[PDB]
A paper describes a structure:
Here, an automated procedure is described to identify the positions of many cryocooled crystals mounted on the same sample holder, to rapidly predict and rank their relative diffraction strengths and to collect partial X-ray diffraction data sets from as many of the crystals as desired. Subsequent hierarchical cluster analysis then allows the best combination of partial data sets, optimizing the quality of the final data set obtained. To demonstrate the general applicability of the workflow described here, we have applied it to various systems and scenarios in which many crystals of the same type are mounted on the same cryocooled sample holder.
The first of these, [name], contains one catalytic Zn2+ ion and three Ca2+ ions per protein chain (316 residues), producing a theoretical anomalous diffraction ratio (〈ΔF/F〉) of ∼2% for data collected at the peak of the Zn K absorption edge. [name] [name] (Sigma–Aldrich catalogue No. The reservoir contained 35% saturated ammonium sulfate, whereas the drops were composed of the protein solution and a solution consisting of 0.05 M MES pH 6.0, 1 M NaCl, 45% DMSO in a 1:1 ratio. Rod-shaped crystals of between 40 × 40 × 150 and 40 × 40 × 300 µm in size were quick-soaked in 6 M trimethylamine N-oxide for cryoprotection before mounting on a sample support. Diffraction data were collected using an X-ray beam of 10 µm in diameter with a flux of 4.0 × 1010 photons s−1 at the peak of the Zn K absorption edge (λ = 1.256 Å) on beamline ID23-1 of the ESRF. Our experiments with crystals of [name] reveal other features of the developed pipeline. The workflow thus ensures that partial data sets are collected from only well diffracting areas of any given crystal. The collection of data of sufficiently high quality for the structure solution of both systems is thus clearly challenging, even from single crystals. Nevertheless, as can be seen in Figs. 6 and 7, for both systems our multi-crystal workflow clearly yields diffraction data of sufficient quality for structure solution.
Author numbering: 1 to 316
Write the structure that this text describes.
């Protein structure tokens, strides 16, 4: 809508207060004009039609329980936009300031979130497996990172290319979580998964095997479930990324950590300059090595650590 840019206040899924950029035209809409072509948040109203209605509020205060998923989808889309712009000089997911659209209250009891090729979509969860999924900054950033991938490497969502696609979303989801710097970790979805169980998550990057996922290429899944294991085999790449950043010894192979900022630079460059729709794990290794070489030099610690990490997870 056309209107006056303003600032509302609300509470997110976890009960935390935050300011949100809104637009006033009769109602206060969840439309943030301060970032690119805008960030727009919609109410799917428990239906599956998308996007639904641009979120309208009478008083610019978003403290109702029903408001909470919208507040977080809107706010965390803004944080993710800021990460890509400030850290990587990327303007929105297409690099041309495309409008970011999100819908909340998708379906009833829907235990997932996704990028549908055009926008973000968040279920409310069933209250036992998940609470509303936009409460997880890593979840929001994971899904928006699929949009970045769509416009860059375009990794096909099946088998090894698909597992790279997934790992890229977990990596940048996590780096956005660290950027915002509120309870950051190397776990995925911990803020919204299983409200009745403390200390668990959907996936772990530091120890993928904790949730049944492979941490070495020898343990890769080659069945047909989950588009050939895209959320399973992502563990192999997540583990490599974790090792590059944090270091460690894994199956007896030692990796010197280079930190999360350099991890982000290396993987962003690989994603945007070297990866292609059909890239496999071996080709990801080559892309990461080339990226680290460009940024830091062939004799650098950074290049050595990329090689060690991929060696540690059995990817040559
Ligand atoms: N995003 C993961 C799991 C999230 C919710 C599981 N019910 C997947 O789609 O496989
Ligand atoms: C739930 C979210 C993190 C994602 N669509 C899976 O994995
Ligand atoms: Ca209100
Ligand atoms: Ca966290
Ligand atoms: Ca996390
Ligand atoms: Ca939990
Ligand atoms: Zn994903």
């Amino acid at each position: 809508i056309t209107g006056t840019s303003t600032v509302g206040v609300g509470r997110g899924v976890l009960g935390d207060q935050k300011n949100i950029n809104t637009t006033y035209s009769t109602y206060y809409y969840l439309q943030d004009n301060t970032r690119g072509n805008g960030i727009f948040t919609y109410d799917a109203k428990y239906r599956t039609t998308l996007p639904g209605s641009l979120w309208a509020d009478a008083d610019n205060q978003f403290f109702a329980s029903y408001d909470a998923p919208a507040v977080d989808a809107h706010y965390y889309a803004g944080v993710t936009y800021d990460y890509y712009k400030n850290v990587h000089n990327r303007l929105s997911y297409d690099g041309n300031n495309a409008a970011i659209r999100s819908s909340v209250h998708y379906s009833q009891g829907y235990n997932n979130a996704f990028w549908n090729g055009s926008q973000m979509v968040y279920g409310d969860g069933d209250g036992q497996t998940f609470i509303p999924l936009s409460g997880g900054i890593d979840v929001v950033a994971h899904e928006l990172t699929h949009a970045v991938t769509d416009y860059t490497a375009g990794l096909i969502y099946q088998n090894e290319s698909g597992a790279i696609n997934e790992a890229i979303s977990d990596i940048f989801g996590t780096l956005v979580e660290f950027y915002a710097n509120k309870n950051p970790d190397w776990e995925i979805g911990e803020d919204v998964y299983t409200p009745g169980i403390s200390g668990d998550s959907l996936r772990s990057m530091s120890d993928p095997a904790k949730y049944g996922d492979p941490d070495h290429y020898s343990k890769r899944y080659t069945g047909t479930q989950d588009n050939g294991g895209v959320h399973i085999n992502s563990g192999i790449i997540n583990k490599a990324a974790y090792l590059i950043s944090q270091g460690g010894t894994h199956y007896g192979v030692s990796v010197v950590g280079i930190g999360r900022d350099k991890l982000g630079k290396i993987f962003y460059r690989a994603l945007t300059q070297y990866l292609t729709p059909t890239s496999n794990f071996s080709q990801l290794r080559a892309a990461a090595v080339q990226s680290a070489t460009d940024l830091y030099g062939s004799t650098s610690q950074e290049v050595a650590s990329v090689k060690q990490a991929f060696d540690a997870v059995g990817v040559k």
